[PDB]
Amino acid sequence: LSSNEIVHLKSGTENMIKLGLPEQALDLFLQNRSNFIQDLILQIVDNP
Amino acid sequence: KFDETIDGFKTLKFKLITILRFNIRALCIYDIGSFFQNTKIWNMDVGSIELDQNIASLISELRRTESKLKQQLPEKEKNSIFIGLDIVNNYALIKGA
């Protein structure tokens, strides 16, 4: 829930699968890309 | 415990009060982009396109300010402080403007 990169995200994602908590894992991942895109919108209407 | 939770309520109204004053004074600050807007013209300056950049800054940090304020705190207070202070200071901002 903190890294803007890919490698830890990729890695600990498949480590979370390696625990076998994949559904929670995917949901957190999608939440990270949600927050990601969310904050990517924070760079700027100037004109439509 | 009523003096206690009373005082915590007083800190709540003080704090949310301070946030609403912060956003509102950010606006009234931001209207001074008109001061000066470099001689808002006489009868024309045609053209006359756009767009008084300080006001775009006001839209910008207003927008991000509401972004992070929607991130941290709860919804109802944000709608409250932002709603009342924003619309009212918009109106009187035009008035003294």
Add this chain to the structure above:
Amino acid sequence: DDDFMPLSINDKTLYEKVLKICWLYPMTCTLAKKTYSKITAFLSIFYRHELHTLNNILVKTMDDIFNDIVNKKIRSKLESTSREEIAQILVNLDYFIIAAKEFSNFMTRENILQNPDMEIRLSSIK
């Protein structure tokens, strides 16, 4: 550069290149079109100073850096009291005043293109 004469009609090789220069008389509009097109062409030093308020008042800095704000043309041409192409060189400055209108027509400008509502420049053209 001198011998203020009309444009020699070579008939016809660089006449299309003269038409790009037109965006006659010998040299002033003929070379100065390449000068200013070279200038604002060179003044596109952005596409890497973008994601900030460079789109703000630095645009007005580009406004002050006009077709070098035309007194640089309009001192020496203002100074040159010479009967050779007198007002015929300035027919390429009434016609380079039509290139001043081309410069205020060189107006799909910046902020990337916003607000497309005015881009006029005609102070030094006046």
